[PDB]
Structure formats: structure tokens, C-alpha cells
UniProtKB/Swiss-Prot annotation:
Domain text: Binds FRP via the C-terminal domain (residues 170-317). Upon RCP generation the carotenoid translocates 12 Angstroms into the N-terminal domain, altering its binding and photochemical properties.
An annotated Gene Ontology molecular function: chloride ion binding
Classification via Gene3D superfamilies: 3.10.450.50, Orange carotenoid-binding protein, N-terminal domain
Name of this protein: Orange carotenoid-binding protein
Predominant localisation class: membrane
InterPro entries: NTF2-like_dom_sf (IPR032710), NTF2_dom (IPR002075), Orange_carotenoid-bd_N (IPR015233), Orange_carotenoid-bd_N_sf (IPR036917)
GO cellular component, as recorded: phycobilisome; plasma membrane-derived thylakoid membrane
Domain OCP N-terminal: 17-168
Organism domain of life: Bacteria
Length: 313
């Protein structure tokens, strides 16, 4: 019989970029000031080649009050507020931050980065030198492909703050209207004509989450890169609406195999673009589907791949 935990094992020879969670683990060991300085350095150097897209208007409005609070602080208090976030200390600011969706957290830091560059928010101390462990962490990051680099940064950002309780309030950007069916493009996948997989891709590309979720079984799950499975339609739909808007999925090739009891397992490789970087960063991605006899999604995993040589053939 199939369980979510066991389905995690399909296509086991897929080599995921586990250097990413490895690096985040090392990063999380560092002193808070080194964490902030390390990301500042990474951000400035990346900025020479890649431009981050501007945060959406709604996002900025939601982070506005927190941002102004920090801006009104004296420089030492500003540095303390940022250290609190990095240390995951329990403060009202850290609790507010923890209630934000990833995009709102990212836009928050986007704006603080501008202000630090402009000198209106306490910057990293001049001539600051990273610790021994911190220097090696940054070196690892700069050795990564851009897709892995931005994933490390995002995970660092999402990890900050303080979560008290599970059913604490959740704040996310408004859900965008699905793309009008007329202007929708359709993907083509070498080797794969499976309607569920193609509909999965096309609806996500159209931000049509209501149609997308109907592809799943009631107890079905979605496993984002380096995260635990998100289980059930309620939780998966929430994830779509809060975190999966305006993606571009560009699947390339796949393979289709039988599984136990009339199930089918399908692996697809290709690229994904995040709206934070548009076409300037193409992440190498595998999708691993487990479909039931009716073609419903019992499980789909999304893996960030170790390197372009992990793409099928
Ligand atoms: C923090 C910080 C700073 C600021 C730093 C800043 C501003 C950093 C900002 C960094 C940014 C903007 C990072 C964004 C990354 C986005 C990624 C990895 C998205 C991937 C999505 C994927 C793979 C989607 C996959 C998907 C597909 C395909 C599905 O099929 C299902 C959906 C799913 C979602 C799973 C300063 C510079 C000020 C220094 C101080 C300091 O600490």
C-alpha cells in the first residue's frame, strides 16, 4: 500500500542539490552579525550580475509598518532589530516577521538592503571581516550555480524571526486572477503525454490554483525542494496561493513507469524561473509524480538538481 512517506522514495537515483540544505545548516551555526554581513556581501556581489525584481505594491504595504519602525530607530537599535531576526529571538517584530509569507519577508529585506546602500539604515560596520567559518560558508555559496545561490538566500530569509504557535495569523499577498484561457500557452514534454502532468504544468503557469488542486487526491501531497511533504488539499492549495504565484515552469523531458496497484510514476526534468529574477536565473528542476489508477496526484516532489548533468540524458 502507498503512503506519502514511502512515495518520497520514487526515482531514488535523482541527485538533488543537497549542498543547499548543507550550506544553510553551516550558515545557521554562525554568529548573527556574521550571518547579516555574509548575506550583505553575497547580495552586493550577486547584484553586479543579477538584478532582483522589485517587490510588489501589496507586499510593500504589508511590510510598511515594520519597515518604518526600524527606520525610526537609532542606528544601534536598528542593528539590534536585525540581529534579533537572525537570532530568531522572541520579540514583537520577530513575531510579525514570522507571520509573513516568504515574498513579504523577501520584500522587507529588499527594502532594508536599499536603505543600507543609501545609508539611512545602519549598514554592516565598515571593514568588517567575517569569522573563519563564515568566510568558508560564503566561498561555498559563491561556488554554487545561480539557481542554488538564490535558494540559499531565500531559505536564510525565511528562517529568520520567531514562530509562536501554528495557527498564528498568516499574512500573504493577494491572490492574482488566473490567466485568461485564451492567452494561455501549453507546455510540451518529450516522452510525456500524460494529461495530469501536462495539466499540472499548464495550470500552475496560468496561476489557476483552483483547477490545479482538483488534480490531487484528497490525501495527496506536494513536496517542495528540501521541505517535508505538504499533505491534503487544504494545505496544498494554501501553499499554492501563498507561495506559488507567477512562476514559469519549463519542463523539457520525462519518463513514465508503472508502479504498484495500477499506479504510475513519472519523472520530468527541466527548468523553473521565479518572478524575482525572471529569465536571468533558470533553476534546474525535477518533478517526481505518483499517480493513482484514475490519474490523480497522490504525490508530487519538486527537486532542485545538483547540476545540469542531472537533467535526463
Ligand atoms: C537578508 C539580508 C539582506 C537581504 C537579502 C535579500 C533581499 C535577498 C533576496 C533574495 C531573493 C529575492 C531570493 C529569491 C529566491 C527564489 C526562489 C529560490 C524560488 C524558487 C521557486 C521554485 C523552485 C518553485 C518551485 C515550484 C514548482 C516548480 C512546482 O511545480 C510546485 C510549486 C513549487 C513552488 C514547489 C541584506 C542584503 C540587506 C543583508 C542583511 C540580510 O540578512
Amino acid at each position: 500500500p502507498f503512503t506519502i512517506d514511502s512515495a518520497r522514495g520514487i526515482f531514488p537515483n535523482t541527485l538533488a542539490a543537497d549542498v543547499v540544505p548543507a550550506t544553510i545548516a553551516r550558515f545557521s551555526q554562525l554568529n548573527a552579525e556574521d550571518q547579516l554581513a555574509l548575506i550583505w556581501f553575497a547580495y552586493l556581489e550577486m547584484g553586479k550580475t543579477l538584478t532582483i525584481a522589485a517587490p510588489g505594491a501589496a507586499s510593500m504595504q504589508l511590510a510598511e509598518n515594520a519597515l518604518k519602525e526600524i527606520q525610526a530607530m537609532g542606528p544601534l537599535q536598528q542593528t539590534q532589530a536585525m540581529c534579533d531576526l537572525a537570532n530568531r529571538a522572541d520579540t514583537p517584530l520577530c513575531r510579525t516577521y514570522a507571520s509573513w509569507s516568504p515574498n513579504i519577508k523577501l520584500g522587507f529585506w529588499y527594502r532594508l538592503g536599499e536603505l543600507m546602500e543609501q545609508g539611512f539604515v545602519a549598514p554592516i560596520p565598515a571593514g568588517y571581516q567575517l569569522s573563519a567559518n563564515a568566510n568558508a560558508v560564503l566561498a561555498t555559496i559563491q561556488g554554487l550555480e545561480s539557481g542554488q545561490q538564490i535558494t540559499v538566500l531565500r531559505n536564510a530569509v525565511v528562517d529568520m524571526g520567531f514562530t509562536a504557535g501554528k495557527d498564528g495569523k498568516r499574512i500573504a499577498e493577494p491572490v492574482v486572477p488566473p490567466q485568461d484561457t485564451a492567452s494561455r500557452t501549453k507546455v510540451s514534454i518529450e516522452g510525456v503525454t500524460n494529461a495530469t502532468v501536462l495539466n499540472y504544468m499548464d495550470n500552475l503557469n496560468a496561476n489557476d490554483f483552483d483547477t490545479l488542486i482538483e488534480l490531487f487526491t484528497s490525501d495527496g501531497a506536494l513536496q517542495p525542494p528540501f521541505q517535508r511533504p505538504i499533505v491534503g488539499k487544504e494545505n496544498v492549495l494554501r501553499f499554492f496561493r501563498e507561495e506559488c504565484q507567477n512562476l514559469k515552469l519549463i519542463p523539457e523531458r520525462g519518463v513514465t513507469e508503472p508502479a504498484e496497484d495500477g499506479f504510475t510514476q513519472i519523472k520530468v526534468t527541466g527548468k523553473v524561473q521565479t518572478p524575482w529574477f525572471g529569465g536571468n536565473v533558470g533553476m534546474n528542476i525535477a518533478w517526481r509524480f505518483l499517480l493513482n489508477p484514475e490519474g490523480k496526484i497522490f504525490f508530487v516532489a519538486i527537486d532542485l538538481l545538483a547540476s545540469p548533468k542531472e537533467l535526463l540524458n
